[PDB]
């Protein structure tokens, strides 16, 4: 069955981006998906995205600008201490100068760089570059 809606959302974005499409439809939506997309949008990896209300879980239409190399989830959401963030960025990111590991911390969903600024850590949630 459907065990992770975030994995489905990011997989759909990856498949649409690899084929050169400039838009992708995501179903279902969720708070975690929207806040994950906001982090991607803030760093310019996607454009404007749209939420469609159907009196259900919802749908999202995302505008892609071709800058996204890969976005993905990390299943399961491992617990990450502040000292463990370095190991995750080494394994997941292509370089030390760009790319982001997305975490869910009690201070909110944020990239690994923002998490270091406010000195918080949570569970790993995904990555983008």
């Amino acid at each position: 069955t459907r065990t992770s809606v975030l994995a489905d959302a990011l997989n759909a974005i990856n498949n649409a981006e690899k084929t050169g499409k400039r838009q992708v439809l995501i179903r279902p939506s969720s708070k975690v998906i929207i806040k994950f997309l906001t982090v991607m949008q803030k760093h310019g990896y996607i454009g404007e995205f749209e939420y469609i209300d159907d009196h259900r879980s919802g749908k999202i239409v995302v505008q892609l600008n071709g800058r996204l190399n890969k976005c993905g989830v990390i299943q399961p959401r491992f617990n990450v201490k502040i000292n463990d963030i370095e190991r995750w960025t080494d394994n997941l990111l292509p370089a030390r100068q760009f790319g982001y590991v997305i975490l869910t911390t009690s201070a909110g969903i944020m990239d690994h760089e923002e998490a270091r600024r406010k000195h918080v850590s949570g569970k790993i949630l995904g990555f983008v570059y």
Binding site: P76, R77, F78
Partner: protein, 143 residues
């Protein structure tokens, strides 16, 4: 999903599965079964002394054609009988019946080496004197 559990609470399944599957690794299996302790002629030791029973020539395997000159040795520690190759040109004349010889493996760790069939040990010393020292006339056999 790659055929293995990924859940955060599935450490027991992952740990047990690896434990079950390391038995397919013969290096791991031989270490825990203690096969060297139970089955190996040396009992897990690197070397072993013994008494020369007889000097025997062993025909090499094809395509080689030679007489590999070995000895039959009964180990002192456990009484087992093994065949040990006596290396170098003419070192069989340094080894006599009822001599005490120190043995060692061929370096293939329990397997036969080269064309020599069924021989897994080599003679290192005879009568307490290195076989290499005898071959190079550095020392003389005490007799």
């Amino acid at each position: 999903g790659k055929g293995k559990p990924r859940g955060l609470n599935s450490a027991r399944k992952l740990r047990v599965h690896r434990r079950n599957n390391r038995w397919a690794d013969q290096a791991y299996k031989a270490r825990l079964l203690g096969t060297a302790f139970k089955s190996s002629p040396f009992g897990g030791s690197s070397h072993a002394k013994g008494i020369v029973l007889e000097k025997i020539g062993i025909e090499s395997k094809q395509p080689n054609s030679a007489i590999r000159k070995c000895v039959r040795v009964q180990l002192i520690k456990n009484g087992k009988k093994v065949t040990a190759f006596v290396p170098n040109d003419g070192c069989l004349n340094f080894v006599d019946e009822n001599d005490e010889v120190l043995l060692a493996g061929f370096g293939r760790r329990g397997k036969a080496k080269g064309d020599i069939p069924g021989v897994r040990f080599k003679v290192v010393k005879v009568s307490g004197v290195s076989l290499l020292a005898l071959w190079k006339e550095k020392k003389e056999k005490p007799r």
